[PDB]
Design a protein around this ligand. Structure first.
Ligand SMILES: NS(=O)(=O)/N=C1\NCc2ccccc2N1
Ligand SMILES: [Zn+2]
Length: 257
């Protein structure tokens, strides 16, 4: 089954998921000089004050923090988006070393990690129907660099010891995702895909320009997670990122001049 190793990683995914070679795959390199400021982009609106987190799960590929999405609690609106997109989960991608780990790159620069806040378009009723639509999803991507600790991340770091292996979960109520955001909401946007199988081309990507800083100790704890299940040989959960894919017939737009 798919993963990030030499025998099941990104270069192999196309055999089971032919869309891997499609026309709007993600991630991409963001060439900052070619991206064009779009004065038509409406203001972006991140409304996370009523977010209701539920649980944290090691799914064998990353860890997901899951939210109650049965009502408009935590939503993303504005920017390139029409209507309202509900937060369903967030997760990260990260490296074995601080010099890699992000999926998107900025003028070919790799960050140490990348946070994905995944949202679905409420016009389609449920996530499963949304991922059959070209405008079904919006993912807010945030780069992580190593420097000072991010206080709003520490509650995540401290629960990781309880979900070390694939299939383990833990209660994760009362987590506030506002604590994961940088100061600025300046962003780049483009149409793309999920970056893990099934690689569905449903996503409006919104990638923030400003990274958050996390401490070396915080990212080191990500790297102590395991891809394997309990009782199986230990394989550290590191380098769970897909590299940049061809931009093809797309333009990246900037919200800022
Ligand atoms: N890295 S990503 O683009 O968020 N990929 C994702 N997100 C959420 C999801 C849900 C179900 C199946 C696959 C995926 N893949
Ligand atoms: Zn992701």
């Amino acid at each position: 089954h798919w993963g990030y190793g030499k025998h099941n990683g990104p270069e192999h995914w196309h055999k089971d998921f032919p869309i891997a070679k499609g026309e709007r795959q993600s991630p991409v390199d963001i060439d900052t000089h070619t991206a064009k400021y779009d004065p038509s982009l409406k203001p972006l609106s991140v409304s996370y004050d009523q977010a209701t987190s539920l649980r944290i799960l090691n799914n064998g590929h990353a860890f997901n923090v899951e939210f109650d999405d049965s009502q408009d609690k935590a939503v993303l609106k504005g920017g390139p988006l029409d209507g309202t997109y509900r937060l369903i989960q967030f997760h990260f991608h990260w490296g074995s070393l601080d010099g890699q780990g992000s999926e998107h790159t900025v003028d070919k620069k790799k960050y140490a990690a990348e946070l994905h806040l995944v949202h679905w378009n409420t016009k389609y009723g449920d996530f499963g129907k949304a991922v059959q639509q070209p405008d079904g999803l919006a993912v807010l991507g945030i780069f992580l660099k190593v420097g000072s600790a991010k206080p709003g991340l520490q509650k995540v770091v401290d629960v990781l010891d309880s979900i070390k292996t694939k299939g383990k979960s833990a209660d994760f109520t009362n987590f506030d995702p506002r604590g994961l955001l940088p100061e600025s909401l300046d962003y780049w946007t483009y149409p793309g895909s999920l970056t893990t199988p099934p690689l569905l081309e449903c996503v409006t990507w919104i990638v923030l320009k400003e990274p958050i800083s996390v401490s070396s100790e915080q990212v080191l704890k990500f790297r102590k997670l395991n891809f394997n299940g309990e009782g199986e040989p230990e394989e550290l959960m590191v380098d769970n990122w897909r590299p940049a894919q061809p931009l093809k017939n797309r333009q990246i737009k900037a919200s800022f001049k």
